[PDB]
Amino acid sequence: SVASFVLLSMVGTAVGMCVCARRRCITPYELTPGATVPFLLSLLCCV
């Protein structure tokens, strides 16, 4: 019972870290007037 809980906590943390990186990565492009997000960032990374 204990081992299952701990393993579940480890996976959930990895997901949270990915969300944090994505938001800080992309944010600069949403403030510039007339800017367009490059293809690679729009589709594949920091989506």
């Binding site: 944010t27 600069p28 492009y29 949403e30 403030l31 510039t32 007037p33 007339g34 800017a35 367009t36």
Partner: protein, 151 residues
């Protein structure tokens, strides 16, 4: 004239918002609300790295938008309170022109295009330096001289 809107708090004017291109931008450190009833209903995003908040301009106000560029040659520029000289990567204002409470004013090029927004500045004897938010192709950047204080 029409592109500038007042920001008020409890009856007092704290600063201004500027409607440029397809986005409405307001400095993050200024308190208060937007005088325009329609703009006050929009959701905004915040970023503490550049002290900016922005939102999308609604369709029925698009005709009021000003034009902008990114080219910044050495020379002279105009603003509400007089002339400004730009050289050496710094914007120079004659000492005594400008006081706290007058943040959020755009700087215009010779043809009336938007190039920067000033948010504070430094104090020095004969000439003062400004702290400005400017941009480049596909990026935004912030310039703050040593000793600058918020206005």
């Amino acid at each position: 004239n029409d592109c500038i809107f007042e920001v008020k708090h409890e009856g007092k004017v704290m600063g201004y918002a500027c409607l440029v291109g397809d986005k409405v931008m307001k400095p993050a450190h200024v308190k208060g609300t937007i005088d325009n009833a329609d703009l006050a209903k929009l959701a905004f995003k915040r970023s503490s790295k550049y002290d900016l908040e922005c939102a999308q301009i609604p369709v029925h106000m698009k005709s009021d938008a000003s034009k902008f560029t990114h080219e910044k040659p050495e020379g002279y520029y105009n603003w509400h309170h007089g002339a400004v000289q730009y050289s050496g990567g710094r914007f120079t204002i004659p000492t005594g022109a400008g006081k706290p409470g007058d943040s959020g004013r755009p700087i215009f090029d010779n043809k009336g295009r938007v190039v920067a927004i000033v948010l504070g500045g430094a104090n020095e004897g004969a000439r003062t330096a400004l702290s400005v938010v400017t941009w480049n192709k596909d990026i935004v950047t912030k310039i703050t001289p040593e000793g600058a204080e918020e206005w």
